[PDB]
RNA sequence: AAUAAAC
């Protein structure tokens, strides 16, 4: 039962797992203001330079990165990779709730942002 | 890329059903169809259906129904298949095939007008007196077949551009009286929705449109207008009384052309939306919404309604046979049909795609009926999830086979009728007692003072005998010769005299001691049939024995003119025979290649084939075969199956009856099953587990049923390797079973398994719930399965949104007032051990809340020597309308061994819940990604990582509307949208990021995806709201694609049926994957991924197989395989129109091979691997 | 102002959460056949759980005739709007107003989700792509932006020197056609913003481009009457067909996803439909509004029923077959209707005034007593 | 931070 058992595939090495490692013909993006939001990070950067910075179709990190944008939990950023926000999803980074520094207690109880005293 | 779609399970669940002279005009017929596959039925009087018939089409039936033609001695059929195909096929003697009289090609472009999408099926009718036929062909037009060189040119009549403006057609029926045959019609000129009654209030009408078939003209007589809002079919009331009754959602109509509209209400929901003069129904609150009725007599009528209730309406007649009031009753309640038949006066087929199909019987109580149950046809309904799973008692004499040892478990039917269904599709049987016995290849065992007494065996020097009964142990007297050989061992008289025959020798015996003997040329085998024993020897010579009392045999030679050698004989009597001119026969095989069946108390030739080891379809009056068997099989050993063994090539005949020879043929049936002294491999047995009918022996061996339904039933026993010999055997501590020799010379006592039933096509035990199974789920770990149900209650409150809190609102309404249906949801949990569902261990939901996915997730652990657990996951999210904003709950679940409660041992297991917190909108699907559990909340996908206690997110994207399937394999996750898409993902998991690889760009509406797997190619199986089959496959280099964003299908396949089942599993092709499914019509199919070389010389068999051969209704298999048009890359060859290339006989399956430019030994080398790499499950 | 700092109460928004349908849907799928298997919806407000998408009832159109009101979606600046879409995964409303502002509005609780400065003038035409990736905007000056899907200003230029009408592209995302307000629709490539060839001969200013979904046509409008409909070719630029249909100043011109139908209205308070295969003759035509009919929106999965705009702020449902309308709203839209978009899932509509608003429309609940201002 | 809170 549960095919991981049955049909056991970890020894195969697919042409889809090895064509996005090297990228296989990737078309570099038009329209240089671009973001493409959802794009897989690029191991080319990550161990050497892949050269078309900005004009790259795959992502580009820096750790320089401290909390999370309010923007990109929705899908608008205009900023793109050079925001100086962290666009991955964890929910400890967030920034703090406007309103409890401000006007005492939230109104709804759902608040994702981070609340503290 | 390049694969096969095969198929390994017959469809199941009629929808169709009537009862005509199928084969002729004495006896009546039972005549179903379901999707693509029409059965027909005779009925033995207790009562049981019995098969006649089965035909399979490449298309699937859309409508049915019968005439009798002038002058014709059966009665026609009338099959409508999808995009306006009318088929007349009619039965045909001679042949045991159907003859296709008329085809009718009707799709037209200038016919649609304009719409591309259809929507409405095409609905055939005929006349009560058989004057002509109807067609509505596209909801929009009419086809009428004129009758009376038998038929006469049709003619479309355009139906929106007569009288009356029809434009939605909802029934039409023909009318009884009317020397015309006058059609009624069903329709809406001003079409409105249920839910908008306050600007349209009612609009249903109807038109009885008198139909000249000389004059071709048609005029509107008897119109009416003001209808109920929802009316449902039209139903023609019969001769004496006439008229039409009307079957709305919440009323009850009944109309004539001479009488005022009288018409009925049946629930108290036609207050404010309906201004017909209704009437009120006493003592009745209920609803014809999917009702099926037919008319038993005349002025009766059984309603089988949605709930499976079934009504008797009596329309009450006065004097002037008009109609003055209705009356009801509350019969017995049966299963939730699709159709409904009055076959003889007192039955009542139901037929049903969820649910048993089943036939009634019903008698009047001392006007008033009650029902009883004679008999029920076993549906594997619709299967709407099923897990792959592990079945329990598995012997330890088979326990180190290299293969896994596997079976599913199919959440089938629906409703009151929801069920599981334990699928199975060999035989493993239970091994009570081995030995190991070298040297000895023969056995028998025969009856001595029912059971057996002795097995007696073989060598090729000596004789072993065993003695049975307390213990089973070596016998040493006298008696046998063990000073040789026994070419035979078997019973004579009946069970109270035995015969051996040594290669010299012929021995009686009246139980151990020897009765007499008589001397004889190797003798190579015998033929011990009833009271006479014919011996052959190795020349070609035949002897023939006799009992006769003084009891001692007596030598009677057969006179024949051997004009070449016989190499082989059968015998074979009639206890409930057709062999007309307990008789007994002589089935005799010469070397010259012919077949001769002899009466046996003379000998004078009977029947005689002339061209005999070939392999004809049908045989008729007027090589090196090895083994010839005749044998009856079914209910009084009613109907004979002719058995032969040419050529390392299985080949079985029916038989059936046809007009001073026999008069009967014998009809070749299909087969999956190939053989690649004188030992017998066709083994008869009568009474094991009930069962009769023979054991093939050989490389593959092969379990041959037939029971009283006389459906023939093929099971393989692929456990244990090739088998030798075989007998069958019973004893004290074995009951009823079987005995057979491994290939390694292990003698093993056996019992097949009890909780199976091996009368289906697949060996399958129906498990029934009596609520709706959504989803199954194997558990590796402490081994059980947990299914997600749900029972209907009545609802009762209604919820709002006030900006504050929830407020419910309370229904109140009249007494007289159905209710709206509530569904509560639990999750069982199912023991394999014994298919009872665990006590005390079921899960309920909220009250509200709906489980829309199961699934066994694999998260990682810091427990296990491993990292996986094979945790159980639900996501379930709470349907309260669309003025309430839909939120979901992830549920964790896995099942711990407890310590058992005292007298039941199967309360050892019970669910922890892990998890169970209420998520941020609705949970549509889950997935497991090298143990990270991947959810999607509403237009996000989550991917959770599981603590020690909690679910932590790591990323995500923004997906399309409502994903609903995801599966996935190595970081790489396969989604499926409603009507969008499938939107394949990737997680690299050095960052948390999530990420969108490519997407079908096309709008489709997904029911479920898989993963086809070739060596490196890996495929993406998606199946289409139009009963499709396609394969997208991620192509970078490829131009016609864009750079890494659009996918490309490769393989495109019509199955005729919806899928939504998927599962992989390794074939028996060094890498490749058998990814199967299980079609929604309940059948079973495959896709075997192959090579492109072996490909195109079978693309060249089928492109010949289907010009070449007459299809069954004149169909066109490639157009029935084309995509959606029932733009196309097709590249999955059509495995069950290659199959016909092995029913051929060796003639005719060589001119194939010639025609396409090869020799026939390789194409059978090409296919029968496609066979043997598929015997899983 | 509103800076999104100034706090507020909570409330529960009203909502038309198709979820319920679909999850419905999915359920009955499996044990379905056809629509002739599933159980009917009885007229009663205790049956609200059994109402499945448009994709559930396929015949029986009358579903999606959303004569239902919701929600009045309208700015504080208060600016007519001209165009409004839909986000193709129905995640939210873009709305394209007078001052090129685009207030993106929630899609399933209608609140409000941000507001833009696209373009310096009233935004005129608005197309997404045929996947999720961009969307063109053209506007009174003369520009043509792109967008992406996060609403982010990608490449712009300049198409014409007068107002583009409408916009509308290939069959696949590579070459879009602007027609403006000096009688050229021009072809454009995606990548490059070149203008490919020029439609001239119209003979007047034409205010309304739609490419056929498969054969590669250019079908164009007219304000002037002896030319008033012009067939084109995009890879020849050769006028293919003129079509004499109506009096004056067509306002849209539409075709199906079916691609055998023209559908046609115009300022003569008629809409018309035409087969593109057979133009001599004339399918069915359609009387019932009062005033100019100015906007069409054919339906996503129901092929064979639109919705239509009045200048008088009627609205009109027609479905063809029927020679009278489904079902409409006179008098009930305030104001001129300039265009109207359908949900993905074709279960909600939306308007567009030539007032400050915008109204969502959905279909009726089952049971309830039509007697609001908008119908009765 | 770029309108998170715009009945
Ligand atoms: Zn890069
Ligand atoms: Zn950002
Ligand atoms: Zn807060």
Redesign the interface.
């Known amino acids: 039962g549960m095919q991981e058992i049955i049909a056991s595939v970890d020894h195969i090495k697919f042409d889809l797992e090895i064509a996005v490692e090297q990228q296989l013909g990737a078309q570099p993006l038009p329209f240089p203001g671009m973001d493409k939001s959802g794009a897989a990070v690029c191991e080319f950067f990550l161990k050497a330079a892949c050269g078309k910075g900005g004009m790259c179709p795959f992502r580009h990190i820096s750790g320089e990165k401290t909390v999370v944008c309010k923007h990109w939990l929705r899908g608008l950023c205009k900023k793109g990779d050079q925001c100086e926000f962290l666009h991955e999803y964890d929910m400890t980074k967030m920034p703090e709730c406007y309103f409890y520094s401000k006007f005492g207690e939230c109104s709804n109880k759902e608040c994702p942002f981070l609340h503290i005293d | 890329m390049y694969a096969v779609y095969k198929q390994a399970h017959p469809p199941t669940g009629l929808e169709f059903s009537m009862y005509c002279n199928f084969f002729n005009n004495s006896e009546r017929n039972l005549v179903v169809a379901g999707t693509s596959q029409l059965y027909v039925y005779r009925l033995n009087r207790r009562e049981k259906l019995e098969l006649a018939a089965s035909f399979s089409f490449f298309g699937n039936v859309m409508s049915m129904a019968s005439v009798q033609l002038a002058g014709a001695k059966r009665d026609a059929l009338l099959l409508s298949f999808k995009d306006a195909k009318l088929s007349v096929v009619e039965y045909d003697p001679g042949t045991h095939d159907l003859k296709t009289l008329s085809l009718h090609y009707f799709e037209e472009p200038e016919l649609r ?5 259809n ?3 095409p609905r055939v009718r005929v006349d009560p007196d058989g004057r002509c036929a109807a067609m509505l062909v596209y909801g929009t037009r009419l086809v009428v077949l004129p009758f009376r060189s038998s038929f006469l040119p049709s003619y479309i009549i355009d139906v ?1 551009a007569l009288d009356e ?1 029809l ?1 939605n057609i909802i029934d039409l029926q023909f009318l009884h009286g009317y020397y015309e045959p006058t059609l009624l019609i069903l329709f809406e000129p ?11 209030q009612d609009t249903c009408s109807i038109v009885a449109i008198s139909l000249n078939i000389t004059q071709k003209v048609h005029p509107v007589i008897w119109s009416l207008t003001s209808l109920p809002f ?1 009316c ?1 079919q039209a139903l023609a009331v019969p001769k004496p009384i006439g008229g039409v009754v009307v079957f709305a ?2 009323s009850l109509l009944y109309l004539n052309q001479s009488v005022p509209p009288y018409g009925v209400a049946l629930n108290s ?1 036609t207050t ?2 309906t201004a017909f003069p209704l009437r009120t129904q006493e003592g009745v609150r209920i ?1 014809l ?2 009702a099926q009725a037919t008319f038993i007599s005349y002025d009766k009528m059984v309603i089988s309604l ?1 709930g499976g209730e079934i009504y008797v309406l009596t329309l009450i007649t006065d004097g002037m046979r008009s109609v003055r009031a209705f009356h009801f009753d509350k019969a017995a309640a049966s299963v939730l049909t ?1 159709s409904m038949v009055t076959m003889e006066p007192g039955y009542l087929f139901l037929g049903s ?2 649910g048993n199909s089943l036939l009634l019987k019903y008698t009047e109580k001392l006007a008033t009926y009650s029902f009883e149950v004679c008999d029920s046809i076993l549906n594997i ?2 299967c ?1 999830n099923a ?4 079945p329990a008692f598995l012997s330890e004499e088979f326990q180190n086979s290299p293969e ?1 040892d ?1 079976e599913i478990v199919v959440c089938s039917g ?2 009151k009728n929801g069920a599981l269904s334990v699928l199975q599709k060999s035989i493993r049987p239970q091994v009570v007692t081995t030995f190991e016995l070298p040297g000895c290849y023969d056995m028998w065992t025969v009856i001595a003072p029912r059971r057996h007494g002795f097995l007696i065996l073989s060598r090729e020097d000596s004789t072993m005998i065993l003695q049975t009964g307390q213990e089973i142990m070596e016998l040493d007297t006298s008696g046998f010769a063990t000073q040789g050989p026994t070419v035979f061992a078997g019973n004579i008289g009946d069970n109270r005299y035995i015969v051996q025959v040594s290669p010299l020798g012929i021995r009686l015996l009246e139980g151990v001691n020897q009765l007499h003997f008589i001397p004889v040329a190797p003798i190579v085998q015998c033929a011990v049939a009833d009271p006479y024993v014919v011996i052959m020897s190795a020349e070609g010579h035949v002897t023939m024995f006799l009992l006769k009392s003084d009891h001692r045999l007596a030598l009677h030679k057969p006179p024949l003119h051997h004009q070449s050698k016989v190499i082989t004989l059968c015998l074979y009597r009639d206890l409930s025979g057709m062999f007309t001119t307990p008789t007994h026969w002589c089935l005799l095989v010469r070397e010259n290649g012919t077949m001769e069946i002899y009466q046996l108390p003379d000998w004078r030739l009977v029947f005689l084939v002339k061209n005999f080891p070939v392999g004809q379809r049908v045989l008729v009056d007027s090589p090196l075969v090895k083994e010839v068997l005749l044998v009856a099989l079914g209910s009084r050993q009613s109907r004979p199956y002719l058995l032969v063994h040419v050529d390392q090539e299985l080949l079985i005949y029916e038989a059936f009856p046809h007009d001073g020879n026999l008069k009967v043929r014998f009809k070749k049936v299909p087969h999956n099953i190939n053989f690649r002294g004188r030992v017998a491999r066709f083994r008869y047995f009568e009474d094991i587990y009930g069962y009769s009918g023979v054991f093939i022996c050989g490389p593959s061996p092969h379990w041959l049923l037939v029971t009283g339904r006389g459906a023939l039933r093929l099971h393989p026993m692929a456990i244990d390797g090739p088998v030798d010999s075989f007998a069958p055997f019973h004893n004290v501590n074995c009951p009823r079973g079987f005995l057979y020799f491994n290939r390694q010379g292990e003698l093993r006592i056996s019992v097949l398994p009890a909780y199976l039933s091996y009368d289906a096509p697949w060996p399958v035990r129906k498990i029934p719930l009596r609520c709706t199974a ?1 989803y199954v789920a ?1 558990h ?1 770990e402490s081994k059980v399965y947990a299914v997600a149900t749900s029972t209907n209650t009545p ?1 009762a409150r ?1 919820p709002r ?4 809190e929830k407020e419910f609102e309370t ?1 109140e ?1 009249d007494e007289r007032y ?3 249906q ?1 569904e509560a949801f639990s999750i069982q949990l199912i023991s394999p051990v014994s298919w009872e569902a665990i006590p005390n261990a079921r899960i309920e939901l909220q009250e509200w809340e ?1 489980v ?1 996915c199961m699934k ?1 997730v ?1 998260l990682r652990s810091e427990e296990t020597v491993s990292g ?1 657990k ?1 945790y159980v996951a639900a996501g379930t ?10 939120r979901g709950r992830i549920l964790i679940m896995d099942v711990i061994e407890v310590v058992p409660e005292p007298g039941q041992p199967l309360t050892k297991n019970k669910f922890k819940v892990l998890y169970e917190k209420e998520q ?1 909108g ?1 949970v549509t699907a889950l997935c497991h990604c090298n143990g990270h559990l991947v959810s999607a909340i ?2 996000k996908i ?1 991917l959770w990582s599981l603590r020690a206690s909690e679910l ?11 994903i ?1 399937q995801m599966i996935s ?2 970081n ?1 996750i396969l989604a499926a949208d ?2 969008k898409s499938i939107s394949l993902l ?1 997680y ?1 998991e ?4 999530l ?3 490519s ?1 079908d ?1 096309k709008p489709l ?1 997904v ?1 479920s995806v898989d993963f086809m ?1 070739d ?4 495929g993406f199986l998606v199946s289409d709201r139009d009963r499709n089959l396609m394969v997208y496959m ?1 192509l ?2 490829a131009k016609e694609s ?4 659009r996918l490309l299908r490769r393989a495109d396949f019509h199955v005729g049926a919806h899928v ?1 089942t998927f ?4 074939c028996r092709w060094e ?1 490749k ?1 058998i990814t199967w499914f299980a079609t ?1 019509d309940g059948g079973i199919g495959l896709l075997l991924p192959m090579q492109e070389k072996t490909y195109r010389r079978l693309l060249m068999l089928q492109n010949a197989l289907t010009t070449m051969l007459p299809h069954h209704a004149g169909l066109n298999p490639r157009a029935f395989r084309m995509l959606h048009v029932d733009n196309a890359v097709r590249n999955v060859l059509d495995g069950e129109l290659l199959n016909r290339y092995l029913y051929l006989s060796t003639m005719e399956r060589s001119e194939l091979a010639k025609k396409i430019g090869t020799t026939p030994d390789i194409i059978l080398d090409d296919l029968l691997e496609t066979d043997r790499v598929t015997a899983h499950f | 102002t509103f800076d999104g700092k100034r706090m507020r109460k909570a409330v529960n928004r009203k909502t038309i959460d198709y979820n319920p349908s679909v999850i419905k849907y999915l359920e009955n799928r499996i044990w379905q056949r056809d629509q002739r298997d599933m159980r009917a919806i009885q007229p009663d407000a205790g049956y609200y759980n059994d109402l499945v998408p448009p994709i559930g009832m396929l015949n029986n159109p009358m579903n999606a005739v959303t004569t239902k009101f919701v929600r009045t979606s309208t700015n504080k600046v208060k600016c007519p709007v001209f165009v409004v879409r839909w986000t193709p995964e129905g995640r939210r409303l873009v709305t394209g107003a007078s001052s090129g502002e685009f207030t993106l509005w929630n899609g399933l609780t209608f609140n409000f989700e941000t507001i833009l400065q696209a373009h310096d003038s009233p935004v005129r035409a608005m197309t997404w792509s045929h996947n999720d990736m961009w969307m063109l905007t053209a506007d009174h000056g003369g520009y043509v932006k792109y967008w992406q899907s996060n609403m982010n200003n990608v490449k712009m230029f300049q198409a014409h020197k007068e107002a583009i009408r409408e916009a509308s592209f290939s069959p696949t995302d590579n070459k879009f056609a602007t027609c403006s307000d000096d009688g050229t629709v021009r072809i454009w490539d995606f990548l490059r913003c070149h203008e490919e060839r020029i439609l001239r001969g119209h003979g007047a200013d034409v205010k309304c481009v739609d490419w056929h979904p498969t054969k590669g046509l250019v079908v164009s409008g007219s304000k002037d009457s002896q030319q008033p409909i012009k067939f084109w070719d995009p890879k020849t630029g050769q006028s293919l067909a003129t079509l004499h249909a109506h009096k004056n100043t067509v306002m849209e011109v539409k075709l199906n996803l079916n691609g055998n139908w023209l559908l046609t209205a115009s300022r003569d308070h008629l809409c018309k439909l035409f087969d593109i295969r057979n133009l001599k003759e004339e399918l069915q035509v359609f009387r019932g509004h009062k005033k100019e009919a100015t906007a069409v929106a054919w339906h996503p999965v129901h092929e064979g029923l639109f919705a239509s705009g009045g200048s008088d702020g009627s609205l009109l449902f027609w479905h063809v077959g029927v020679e009278k309308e489904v079902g409409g709203m006179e008098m009930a839209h305030e104001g001129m209707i300039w265009s109207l978009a359908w949900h993905p899932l074709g279960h909600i509509l939306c308007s567009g005034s030539n007032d400050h608003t915008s109204k969502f429309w959905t279909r009726n609940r089952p049971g309830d007593k039509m007697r609001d201002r908008y119908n009765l």
């Open positions: 007008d304009g719409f591309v999408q929507v409405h099926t929106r403006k434009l001003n079409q409105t929705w249920p839910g908008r009654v306050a600007v349209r929802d449902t959602v919440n929901l404010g939306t609803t919404d999917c949605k699709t795609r969820l309904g619709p709407a897990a792959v799973g592990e896994p596997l629906h409703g959504h194997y590796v609802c209604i949104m006030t900006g504050e229904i309404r159905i209710h709206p509530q709906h829309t066994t694999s996986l094979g999210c709470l349907m309260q309308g669309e003025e309430v904003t839909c941020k609705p509403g237009q989550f932590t997110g790591m990323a995500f994207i923004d997906t399309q509307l409502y609903h394999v190595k790489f409603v009507m990737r690299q050095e960052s948390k990021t990420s969108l690889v997407r760009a509406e029911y797997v060596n490196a190619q890996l991620y970078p280099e864009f750079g890494g964003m939504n599962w992989r599993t390794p890498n994957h929604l």
